[PDB]
Each structure stands twice: as C-alpha cells, then as structure tokens.
Amino acid sequence: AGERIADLLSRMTLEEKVGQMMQLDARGGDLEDLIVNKHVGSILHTSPEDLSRAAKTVNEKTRLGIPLIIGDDCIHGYSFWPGATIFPSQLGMAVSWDPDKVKAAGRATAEEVSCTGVHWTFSPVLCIARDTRWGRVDETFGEDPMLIGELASAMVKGYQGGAKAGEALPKNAILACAKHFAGYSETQGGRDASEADLSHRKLESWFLPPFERVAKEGCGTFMLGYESIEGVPVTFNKWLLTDKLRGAWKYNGTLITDWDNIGRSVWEQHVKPDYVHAAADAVKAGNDLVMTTPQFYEGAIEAVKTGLLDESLIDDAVSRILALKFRLGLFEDPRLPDAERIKAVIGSAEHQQINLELVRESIALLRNDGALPFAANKVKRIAVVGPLADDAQNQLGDWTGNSGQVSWMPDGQPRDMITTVLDGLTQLTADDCEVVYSRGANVIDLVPDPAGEFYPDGQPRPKIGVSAAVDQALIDEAVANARQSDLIVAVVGDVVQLVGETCSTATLELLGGQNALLDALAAVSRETGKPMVTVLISSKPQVLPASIVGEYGVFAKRVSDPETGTGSILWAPNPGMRGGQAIAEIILGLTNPSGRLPITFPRHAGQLPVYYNQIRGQHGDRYADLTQDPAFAFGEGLSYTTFAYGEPTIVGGASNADGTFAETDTVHAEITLTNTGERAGVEIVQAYIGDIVTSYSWTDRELKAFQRVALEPGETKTVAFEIPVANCTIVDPDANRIVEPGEFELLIGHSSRREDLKRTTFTVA
Amino acid sequence: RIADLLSRMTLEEKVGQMMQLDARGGDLEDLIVNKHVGSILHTSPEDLSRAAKTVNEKTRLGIPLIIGDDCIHGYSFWPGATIFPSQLGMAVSWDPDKVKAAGRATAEEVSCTGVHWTFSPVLCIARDTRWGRVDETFGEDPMLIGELASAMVKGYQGGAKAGEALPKNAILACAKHFAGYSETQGGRDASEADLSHRKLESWFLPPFERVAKEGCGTFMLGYESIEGVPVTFNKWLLTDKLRGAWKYNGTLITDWDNIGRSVWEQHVKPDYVHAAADAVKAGNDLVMTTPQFYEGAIEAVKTGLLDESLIDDAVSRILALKFRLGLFEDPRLPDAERIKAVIGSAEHQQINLELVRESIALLRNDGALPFAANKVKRIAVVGPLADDAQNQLGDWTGNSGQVSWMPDGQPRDMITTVLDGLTQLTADDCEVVYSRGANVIDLVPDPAGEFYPDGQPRPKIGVSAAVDQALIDEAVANARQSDLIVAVVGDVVQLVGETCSTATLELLGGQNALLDALAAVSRETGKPMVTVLISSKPQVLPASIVGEYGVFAKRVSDPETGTGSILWAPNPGMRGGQAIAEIILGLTNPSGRLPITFPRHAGQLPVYYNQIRGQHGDRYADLTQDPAFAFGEGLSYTTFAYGEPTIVGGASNADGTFAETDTVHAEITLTNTGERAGVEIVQAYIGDIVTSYSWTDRELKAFQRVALEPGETKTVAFEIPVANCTIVDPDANRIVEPGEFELLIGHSSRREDLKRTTFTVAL
Ligand SMILES: OC[C@H]1O[C@@H](O)[C@H](O)[C@@H](O)[C@@H]1O
Ligand SMILES: OC[C@H]1O[C@@H](O)[C@H](O)[C@@H](O)[C@@H]1O
C-alpha cells in the first residue's frame, strides 16, 4: 500500500481466484459500479464525462483498491474526444515520410490524452498494407516494413515521451500499443479476419520487422491479432508469443487480445469447443489482458476448478499486469482528469500548428499536367465540386467519432473548425474571387437491410450503404458551375461506411456518380481548356476512371505523365482537421507539395498484389488483358520544382581489404541532388538494397533508407546514407533472417521505379 | 533379355550417363541422340519414325529413347486425332468412367505413333481464376481432381498399376504440375507460391498422393518456387512426401528448363554447375530442356561438387524404366496400319460425343429452353466464337503455339462449331444466319522486337479489340429478323495459358457491347436469347446477362435475372458444336455441373467453395460475396426432389459412434418430378463442426451421376470412409479428429441446395 520495492507485489496473497480476474478488460459503459464490482483490471471506450468516476469507484467501492489501467483508441489524435486535435490518418502521415513530425503528432496526442484519465492508446498500427482490398489500409503506414518501422518507432517515442522498457511513464505521456501482432493485414481475399496463410518465413519476411523494432525499443503494450494464422489464431500462437515476442525479442511489455479474440475462437472460428478450453489455452499461451470476453470469467474459474488450468499461471498473469500498474505509479497516483490542463492543451493553437505542418506534407502530388499551381489573382471564379469537397466527417475518416466505434459524439468532431477543401479553397485563402460549391454526385444510397427492419431484440437494423445511383441533375449543375468558372477542383473519395472493420472493398472504385461526374468534368476541361485538378480524399488507394488515369489495356501510359488523361491529380488520404487548408495552399502555390506514396495504387483489383517488393520468378511480366505497371508506384510524388541526381557512390565503411564488406560493417554512400527549378522544394531521397543472388527466392529490391531533403533554387546537397550490412538480409525456410555473402546493388533516387533510381554495387564476404 | 537384374550397365562413356537430359526435338535428331539424350519431346509425327532408327544405327550403345509429348486432351498435336474437351470441360461432366474412356482412346491413338509417354493429366487445382492454365485443370476441388485424374491415369496406362508391363495400346501417364503451381501470387505464371507444408497437404497434395499410390507412371516437377524453394530442389516434396511417405516408384522429370530458370529467372542458383548439382542431389531423374545441365553436371563431378554415384543411381532409375517398358527389345515404332485403323476412328468420335454431351453446363434457363424445332423458322447465330473452330478447341492443340508442324490447326472438316450445328435444325431450312457481331483481339507486334527467339518470329500479342458498331448493327438486324438469338462469346488462345494470366476476367473486344445490344433486342421484342460461353475458364459477363453486381445482387441462375439463358462449354473439343446444338434444341438434356466457381469480379477472389472459417462479416462494402455461379451448379430439362439423408450403418464402436477405420453408409432419395428423363449429379459434402485448427466448413467427398425417368425415384447410397473426414495440423499431418460431423447431400455446394444429417466420431 506504500513505497516498498515493486517485487513485493507478491502480496497478491489476498486476491481470491475470483478477483484474479484482473486479466479482463471490459467494454464501458456505463455501469462502472457493476464493471468495477466485477474484479476487472481494465476498461476501454469510457466516455469523457465518466473517466472521472472510474478511479473514484475504485477507491471508494472496492475491497482492495487496485487502480484501473484505462485505455482507448486514440488512433490519429484523440479520436473520440470532442474538440481534440485530429491529425491525418496513419496512411496520410506516411505520405509525409517525416518521422519527426509523426513523433510530434504522437507527443501532442499524448499531451491531450494524458490529462483526461486515459493512460493508454491502442496505437500505432504496424499492419502492412499488402492488399488494397483490406478495409483498414487507412490505419497502416503503407506497404513497406522499413517505412512502417521508422514511423511506428517515432510515434511510440512520441506517445511515451521517450520512456523505454521498465521506466517511469511521464505525466504527459501514455502507453503505446503495437497492433495488430501479427499478420492481420494479408488475409484471404483482403477480408477482415479471414485466414492468414502466412508461414513463419513469410511473417518474418514482411510482417515482423516493425514489431521486433518497437518491441526492442520498449513499446509499452502489444495487441494480439484477430485472425487465424495457418490454422492457429494469434491468441494461442506459441511461435509468435513465446518464440518471437517473449523469446527472441525478450519483450517485457504487457499483452492484450483484440476485441473478443477468445470468444471468436469459439463461435466465429470454430477452433475451440467451449469457453473453458478457450480460456485455458489462452492463459497457457501466455496472454495477459483479455479484451471484451465476459465468458472468460466463468471460463477460467471452471478451468481451474476442473483441473484443466493451473491457477499459478493465472497468478503469473496477474503478476505481470500488477507489475505494469506499479510501474506506472497508479497505486499512488491514478492520474485523474485535469480540468485546467484539459482546457489548456486539448485543441491548443500549438497543436493546431503541429497538425498543419504535418498535413502540409501528408498530401501527394501525383500528376501535374502543367496548370499547377493555380494563381489566385489571375482567376475570378473556381468550381469546387464533388461529394468530398465539403464532407468534414468523412474527411476525418475512420476511427474518429462519429466513425461508429463509440456513441457519445453522434455529430462527429465539431464542425466549427474542421477545414474542408471548400473552406480552404479558396473561401479562406484568397480574396473575393468566387468559390462555388456543387455536390456533383452522391457516394452511397442508404437502403433498408434486406433481412428485416429490426434485429430480434426490437432494435432497428441500420441502413446499408450501396453504390449511389447516378443523379444527372447534380452532374448538370456541377457542369454548369464548371463552365462558369476559371478552374475545376473535383474532390472525390470514399466514406466511413466503405472503410474499416468488416468493410473491405473488392472493386477499389469510387462509388456513386463520382465516375460519371469526373467524366463530365474532364469533358468540359478538354473542350474549353479550363484547368482541372482531381483531389482524391480516400482512406486508401482507389481506381479512378479512364478519363482521369487513362485506359488500362495490355499496354497503358504512365499515369503520372503530364499528358495522360485529363487534369492534375492530388492524393490526400484522410488529412485531418487542417487538410482542406493544406490542399488549398498546394493548389494555389502557397505550399509546395512534398508527399510521396507509402503504398502502390493498382489499376484494377485483378492486378493484386501490387506492392513494390515483388518476388522474382514470374514467367512473363503482363496479364493478357492488363499491364502489370501500377497506376502509381511506391515512392511516387511530385513537387513544384525539378531535381537532378548525380551518380551514387560508395565512399567507405568496408573493413576487409578485400573483401570488401563484412557482416558487421556499414555501407556509406553519397549522391548529389540539385534543385534545377525556379522555387524551393523537398525531395524524399529513397535508398533501396537489392540482393542480386539469393539462396532462397526473394524480392529484387527493398527500401532501406530515406531522407527528406530541402533545396533552394540552384542549391545542390550531398545526400549521405549509412546502411548496415546487417540490414541487407533475406529469410531462410526456417524463418531465420541472415546476411548472405555475394553481390548487392544500391539504388538511390526518386521512387521505387527502377527508371527513377541510380545504381551502384558492393560485395559482402 | 534372358537376364533379370544384371542388365543396367555402366559402360557409358564416361558420362553418356547424361541419359538424364530430355531435349526439344525438331529437327536435328542425330545431334540430339549423339548428345546422348535419354529422352526427346515435341517430336514431329514424321520424325517419330526416325528417332529409334537413329538410335539403332548411329549410336555406340543403342540405348532406346523414352519418347514423350503433350497429349493434353486427346492427341493434341497429331493432325486428325480425336480432340476431346479440355480437362475443365471434362470436369463439367463429373463422369470418371467417360474421362477414363477418353484417356483410353487417347492412349490408343498415341501408342501407335512412336510416343510412349504423355505429360498428362494435370492435377493442379484452380484456386485463382486469374491463372492462365485453369483450362488444364479438373477444377477447384481436390476430391473431384483426384477422382478424374485417377480415372484418366487408368485410361492412359490401360489399367497397368506400374508395375509395369505397359500394354502396346497404352502410354505412360504424368502427374503435373507437382506441386502448388496453381496458386501463386496474383495468379501469375509461376510467381511465388506462399504455400506452407500444411497448406500444400491441405489443398494441393491429395490428388498427387492418390495417383502416386495408384501407380501413375511419371511425375513432373513444377516451375514455381514454394516458400523460397523451387520444386526441383524441394526436399520435403521430393524426399519426405513423394519418395518417402508415399513410397512412389515412378520416374520424375522437371518442367521446361526448371534448372536453368533457377539461375536466370529465379536468381536462386549462382550458376548451372551448382544448379545441376543441387538438382541431382535432390533426387531428380530426367531433366527437361536444360542444355547447360550437361556441361553443368560433368563439371560438378570433375570439381568434386557432385558425387558421380548419384548420377549412377539416376541413370539406374531411368534405365529401369526403359527395361520395364521392353524398349530394348521393342522400341515401339510407329504402326502405319494401326494409325490408319484407330486414329480418328468412329468409335473414338462416339466416345468424344458421349463425353462432351455432359461437359456442358446449363447455368440459367429463363424458361424458353429447350426450343422446339418445328416451331422456329430462323435463328441468328452471333458472336466471334460461333464459328471459331481452333479457339473452340483451345490451348494445347496445334495451332495453339507450342509446336509448329500444324500451322493451320486441326482440320476444319473434323470440328463442329456452334454454327455448324445447323445440321440439326430445322432441319434443312429454318435459316441459320451467322453474324460475327464483334472482334475479340487485335494482333499487335511483340514489344520490343520479333526476334531473337531466335531467328524465328515471335508470335503477336493480342490486345482488346476495338468495338465495331457496324458488326453490332448487322448482328442486331439479323437478330430482329430471327425467331431465336444464339450469342456465342468467350476468349481465344492468346488470352489463355503460359504467361497469359488475365486480371479482369472480362470478355475482351466488343463482346460486352454486342451482348448488351442483343439483350436489348431480346427484351424489346420478346425473342428468346441464349448466351453460349465458350471460354478456357470462368469469365465475367456484362450486367445485361448476369445482372448488376453490388453490395446486394440477384442470384444469377434465377430465371428472371438479367436477360436470356446461359450455357457454359469450357473448351468442348471437336464435337462441341453438335452437343451445344443438341442441348439448345432439346435433342440432348444437359447434365453438366460446375467444377469451379464463377466470380462476379476479380476483387472477389478467392471464390472457391471451400472457404476457411473466421471472417468478420460476409460482404465487401461495395460487392456481395455471393459468386455468380457456385461450385456444383447446373441445371437439367426436368426437376428433382431430394429426401432427407440418413445414416444407415457402418459404426463399429460399442456406443453407436463411428471409429476411424469405419465407413459411413448413407442414403437419400431422388425423384424425377418433371416430364422428361434426366441425370442429376448428387453431391456429398462432409463438414467437421469443430476443428482444433481453422478449417473449411464443408468439403466434397462423394458424388454420383443418377439417371431418372419421369416420376422415377431411386435411393442413392453413399459410402464415405471416416479416414477421408480429415483436417491438417500445424505439422502438415492429415488426421481424423473425433467430434461431430455434418453430411450434406444435394444439388450443389450451396448450403441452400443441400440436405443435412450428422454423425459422431470417437476414439
Ligand atoms: O476498440 C479497441 C479495438 O477494437 C477492435 O475492434 C479493433 O480491431 C482494434 O484495432 C481496436 O484497438
Ligand atoms: O511441353 C512440355 C512442357 O512445357 C511446359 O511449358 C509446360 O509447363 C508443361 O506443362 C509441358 O509439359
């Protein structure tokens, strides 16, 4: 009850086995008294007004006063807090390739969260966007393990204020959570929790590296994934939990299952016969906290009383959980909400500035047909058209109220200052040149659920969004507006009903009348010469009409080429509260774009998979009906200037004489970059390593380094890279990551496309 | 000769023991046989005579050649041979006896020409419809593939279980492509296969194990790299499974230049010396079309990298095969009289007709089928596939491209197109007017360059043809002047096979616009319409035919969905137009069922019926997960009523539960409730209710073609061994797990078409 050494938490001697259900984390709320009179150890989804009462109920109505560990989903900012700073999604953040600003966003988020009673965020997401059909692509940092590792490492440091494994969590910091460990992101058909046919070798190859990095850097907690991997759900997966996480990585953080993993193993996966055996196997597998599985309670108790489960294992789990709670000082200070600090830091002008500076880089200029940027004073009227041009809530995207996961913010984040594209462009960022909005099209029509208007409990079944019908009236109005304007700004994308859990998409196409809208607008632009720009605000890459990207035949033109299709192309994944202002600034030349793609755009769903790091061995390089050239490749993106690369050169680091490089050495390389245009810009220099010959089939190149490089007009910089030879690895059939002697190529340049890369070589022996 | 096991003889010179090579023939046999090859493939008909002559007259030791070639669905590249439907079309029939008859006839035609060996049947499983080689498979189900492949191996080898006395009218069978070649990344040709041991055992190995233990003559190792290891060097597949657990005693051969591809294409081996050494160490026998193996293996021995005794053991296995076939006494020279007697004989044509009559699936009947003959007076036969004989035959049939000695393809006089099937109607002059309607592809030169492959020209690449509104207008006028509209669409050989996977699965060219206009005419005038799909694999059809897709969509087989009736004939062979015509006119009742699932969109993949449990939700936010047509679907011209299935015995435990060694006996009644006789393919699926490791919810385990006269009822009886009700554990062990099982018997894989009972397994 006082400061003796934490080892004497062995005074767990008082917990009845009934109370050793400190392992449960239950959905609030809100009947905290019942939930806390249940010997629960954690609660999630606690409403802002009720975070005050939790620790009060602990201190005043419980036998032992064991403080709660309180967590919630603060996914890209304090998602479900009204008025908090809502940053871009993780995918949008990854467009920036800026670890420092992602870390700043994590620090600001933790600053806002740590003064409200929440100790813990279920973030960052380390899943890898390997299948564009997956509904949660917006939550990832893209399709590359290295980039995911860099950004996730930065954001864990931002959340936890630099605290490592075993240290005091600062008052303005929160616990980070690595999810979803592991392999949740490449399942059959891109479906939500379908089967993952991911061997140990493939998991180690493309899924584990970022998890291993943040685990060895002291990420506070880990969340176990939904899906069954090779017949075994992660909750019971010994190789992932024992051999990798606790074993090879020596991870000492706390684990928690995803939403009702144990129950789903029974009723959804048909893997466990009942909740008794499911609970027993979950405890035997080394689980710590159990999220939203009530039947685990009676499941574990009976499992012990029937001799199926040794109670000492439960004692060890409670020991780990209580170790986490004592480490955070919760027994002395449960970190109650701070009204003054809530008024002072949540939504502060400083956090708004951090959000703006991040989102200014979170937008990718994919094509410039020559008309960008537009000059304000040279025009008099701009047609802002498209259902995403003034949709604030869907601009924020999934995992931000009212996205659906909670209900205490039914109107979403306050409209008072979400900056939409209409608000920013240019109804804020230029004088009285007219800015006329036209909806142009609908995205989805809401139709009654075909299985009845009510659930069996009398509650009404919500309507289902389907691809909206084409409304020719909105197209005609949008066309008239465009013809009466000097510029056409089309804003299209998806909505939350098309994103997230259980909401994978198969076609990847824009729904509703958006394709017809873009067709008509492109027709007007071609006919009259009016400049046009298509702004895509979507949770993930989308298939655009041929009028915009060109036909995808057996042979097809490079989509980013200025003469392909009609108009310019900008991508802004889910740019947060300040996204419209940054989009406006880029369109008007106030801000130079500096985003690059962290994920590949497919031309068609049948092109999948389209990630840049393909495995060698294919016979041919085309489908008989579709080019294998993606619409936009990993690393693509443009500025408002031009850059010239010199040739890359190895400058040192090799210790053999020779040789030339040994496994413990580090490759030092240099390449010149020159701003050959008329305005300053930022080029994201990308460094890829390719193992020319491998004993086991592998990809031909992998991202290993990158740098955001700023250049004034005419300025040249020497970009220098340090790549450890220990990072130039492949994986063997037994999932061992090894450095293999032989020849390696180093490709440095503009994108993952080999035509955008300059090449040198080095040898490892 | 009189000796028994003294004959295999290392007088070879010093490595003439490169009997392990199998090189591409055409047309320099003397060099090839003096390269001391042990086998040749792609030998032209005129040259099959000269091979064994060159062996007997110009070689030092006179080791006879083992001669093989691709006889994929009939004697593919022999002019005038009986060309049966593709393996996928054959699988539409669900008729193992007729598939075996086709293999027996094929072997009869091949075994009199000098070829001893066919690279057939294909045991790959169509797990991704994007794959270019789906036409060569028996569908998407391991059990059906095992049944049909077993039957066709028995047909090829004349029942010889190897054995092996190979009869004079039989040829060696080849199980290909072992294994996992059919589910690679993106459905592309030999891209990476992320197939663990457990997944391989689960969905890919069963048919290979079956034909291996039944004595399939040879095995062919697949192109692709499995989990980083190409099959040519895959110890678990070759040693642990094939040679070890299965105790297989047949002969192995790599696919086309596997060893070289490991060097220049997969970048897995540093040079041909190490590639050859690793291939020999892995237990390979014959090496297909890798010349650099020669100097590659010799050097590997001379540098001590490869033990020569391993080569001696490989040569021992090959020569054991050659002695067992009696090639040292009779090399099986071509027989001009037997060629004149059996190749293309009327008996084989009849077998082909009886098979193809069942190889056609009636997928939707809007009510107008079958059409009555004497009541129609003009029919518009429209579509680019309505009279395309060569593309109706499909891939792996000259002129498909793999050989060059038949540049004009199989003789047109022997191919009945759908247009040709105007012989039946009505019968002499109700007019049958053909309209091309649309083009499929335009031929463009290969970028970049037409050589060096090497001096020979590189074939043109097909691109999606432009919509031709003039042909659409002509077809529309023809349709408006007719009593019936028969639209025949599909793909062509340039869109199927090796290096020719497809991503969109849609018809190319103006076929979609053509079908739209024809459907508009049919709706406007009430003229009946039928869409005949002649394509190598399932295709995505326009919304005018299958209905609009979306979050919710109508059942495509429902009579009121879309416009017109829908027939599928994958690649129906020489008698395909006659069978399609007979079915359209009611002369033959359709009895085909789908061996593969039709997706509505490529983004729906995978769509095979045996999905793994665990998904959160059951729809994409923009597309239903209901496929266009499910595995086992198909209709007849009558109706059937099912009773409830019942377990009737077989349990040996002393509490009524079933034991692992038992066999489940079940019965269900089937009644022809219509006005004409028909054949219903009764399907029996097993579902393990609870499994220790995630599994599918149902698997096909039995099926029977049941014939019924009007009003007739039969008791269909099934015997399903409990040893077949298995799952696979993390260590790739196929095990029977005690617990509750459901038995679903009925019309298709859709649970709404299945009736359900249960049984329990214990101990
Ligand atoms: O709400 C907490 C959890 O809910 C689940 O539905 C999601 O899969 C997790 O990403 C999330 O952390
Ligand atoms: O023609 C011989 C071989 O050629 C290869 O390209 C195919 O993959 C094999 O199926 C065939 O047996």
Q: Which of A135, A136, A178 is nearest to B622 (CA)?
A: A135
* Phi and psi based region of residue B401 (left: phi greater than 0; alpha: psi -120 to 50; beta: remaining): left
Cβ neighbours of B716 (radius 10 Å):
20
Between chain A and chain B, how many beta carbons pairs sit less than 8 Å apart? 241
* Phi and psi based region of residue B163 (left: phi greater than 0; alpha: psi -120 to 50; beta: remaining): left
Q: Are strands B739-746 and B734-736 parallel, antiparallel or unpaired?
A: unpaired
Q: Which of B85, B106, B103, B97 is nearest to B345 (CA)?
A: B106
Residues 6+ apart with CB under 8 A from B227: A199, A201, A202, A733, B193, B194, B195, B196
CB contact under 8 A, A191 and B461: no
Q: Which of B212, B117, B122 is nearest to B166 (CA)?
A: B117
Q: Which of B390, B349, B355, B397 is nearest to B72 (CA)?
A: B397
Domain B1-344: give its CATH code: 3.20.20.300
CA distance B424 to A157: 79
A259 lines ligand 1 (CB under 6 A): yes
Q: Which of B682, B687, B650, B686 is nearest to B669 (CA)?
A: B682
Using an 8 Å CB-CB cutoff, list chain A residues near B267: 616, 692-694, 697, 700
Chain breaks in chain B (C to N over 2.5 A) after: none
Quickly tell me which residue has 């649309």 as its tokens.
Answer: B438
Between the alpha carbon of residue B432 and those of residues B382, B391, B416, the distances in Å are 10, 21, 15
Locate A271 and state its tokens.
Answer: 């893997």
Handedness of CA B214, B217, B222, B228 (dihedral sign): positive
CB contact under 8 A, B188 and A623: yes
Number of H helices, E strands in chain A: 20, 30
CA distance B79 to A625: 31
CB contact under 8 A, A231 and B501: no
Where along chain A do its domains lie? Answer: 1-347, 348-642, 643-765
Which among B223, B495, B692 is the nearest to A271, CB-wise?
B692
- Cα(A696) to ligand 1 centroid in Å equals 36
CA distance A45 to A377: 49
CB contact under 8 A, A194 and B615: yes
| Cα nearest neighbour of B506 on chain A | A625
CA distance B169 to B188: 38
Residue A720's Cβ-side half-sphere holds a number of Cα atoms within 13 Å equal to 6
Locate B372 and state its tokens.
Answer: 């009555």
- CB contact A201 to B (< 8 Å): yes
Which among A504, A606, A607 is the nearest to B620, CB-wise?
A504
Q: What is the fold, at CATH topology level, of the domain defined by A1-347?
A: TIM Barrel (3.20.20)
B256 lines ligand 2 (CB under 6 A): yes
- CB contact A133 to B (< 8 Å): yes
Residues 6+ apart with CB under 8 A from A50: A28, A29, A30, A32
Q: Which helix (H) or strand (E) holds A684?
A: strand A681-691
Q: Which helix (H) or strand (E) holds A257?
A: strand A254-257
Using an 8 Å CB-CB cutoff, list chain B residues near A264: 614
**Interface test with chain B among A619, A695, A700, by most B beta carbons within 10 Å:** A619
Which amino acid appears at position A208 of this protein?
L
- CB contact B275 to A (< 8 Å): no
CA distance B545 to A675: 56
CA distance B104 to B154: 8
Closest protein CA for atom 3 of ligand 2? B256
Q: What are phi and psi of B758, to 5 degrees?
A: -140, 155
Q: Is residue B60 exposed (0-12), middle (13-18) or buried (19+ Cβ within 10 Å)?
A: exposed
**Interface test with chain B among A186, A229, A618, A621, by most B beta carbons within 10 Å:** A618
Which ligand is closest in space to the CA of residue B39?
2
CA distance B293 to B269: 13
CA distance B719 to B665: 5
Q: Are strands B726-728 and B713-721 parallel, antiparallel or unpaired?
A: unpaired
Using an 8 Å CB-CB cutoff, list chain A residues near B611: 188, 194
CB contact under 8 A, A506 and B691: no
**Domain B1-344 shares a fold with domain B640-763:** no
CA distance A709 to A697: 34
DSSP assignments along A324-364, one per residue: HHHHTTTTT------HHHHHHHTT-HHHHHHHHHHHTTS-E
CA distance B23 to B34: 12
CB contact under 8 A, A506 and B604: yes
Q: What are phi and psi of A672, to 5 degrees?
A: -90, 140
Residues forming a β-bridge with A365: A570, A638
Quickly tell me which residue has 């007709």 as its tokens.
Answer: B353
- CB contact B131 to A (< 8 Å): no
CA distance A750 to A756: 5
Helix (H, G, I), strand (E, B) or coil at B178: strand
Using an 8 Å CB-CB cutoff, list chain A residues near B505: 606
3-state helix, strand, coil in chain A (%, to 5): 30, 20, 50
Which ligand is closest in space to the CA of residue A261?
1
- Cα(A122) to ligand 1 centroid in Å equals 7
- CB contact A734 to B (< 8 Å): no
Residues 6+ apart with CB under 8 A from B124: B133, B136, B137, B176, B177, B181, B182
Report whether the peptide linkage leading into residue A658 is cis, meaning its omega lies within 30 degrees of zero.
yes
- CB contact A233 to B (< 8 Å): yes
Q: Are B385 and B586 in contact (CB under 8 A)?
A: no
Closest protein CA for atom 9 of ligand 1? A258
CB contact under 8 A, B228 and A697: yes
What are the strands of the beta sheet with A69-72, ordered from one edge? A120-121, A69-72, A42-44, A24-27, A290-291
Residues 6+ apart with CB under 8 A from A618: B188, B189, B190, B191
Interface list for B 451-490 with A (CB within 8 A): 461-464
**Ligand 2 mutation pick, B43, B76, B119, B134, max ligand atoms within 8 A of CB:** B119
Q: Which of A475, A544, A538 is nearest to A507 (CA)?
A: A544
- CB contact A45 to B (< 8 Å): no
Helix (H, G, I), strand (E, B) or coil at B632: coil
- CB contact A193 to B (< 8 Å): yes
Interface list for A 679-708 with B (CB within 8 A): 692-698, 700
A122 lines ligand 1 (CB under 6 A): yes
Domain B640-763: give its CATH code: 2.60.40.10
Q: Which CATH class is domain A643-765?
A: mainly beta
CA distance A748 to A730: 20
Q: Are strands A42-44 and A364-367 parallel, antiparallel or unpaired?
A: unpaired
Query: Distance from CA of residue A211 to its chain's centroid?
Result: 14
- CB contact B605 to A (< 8 Å): yes
Handedness of CA B407, B412, B415, B417 (dihedral sign): positive
The resolution in angstroms reads: 2.3
CB contact under 8 A, A192 and B617: yes
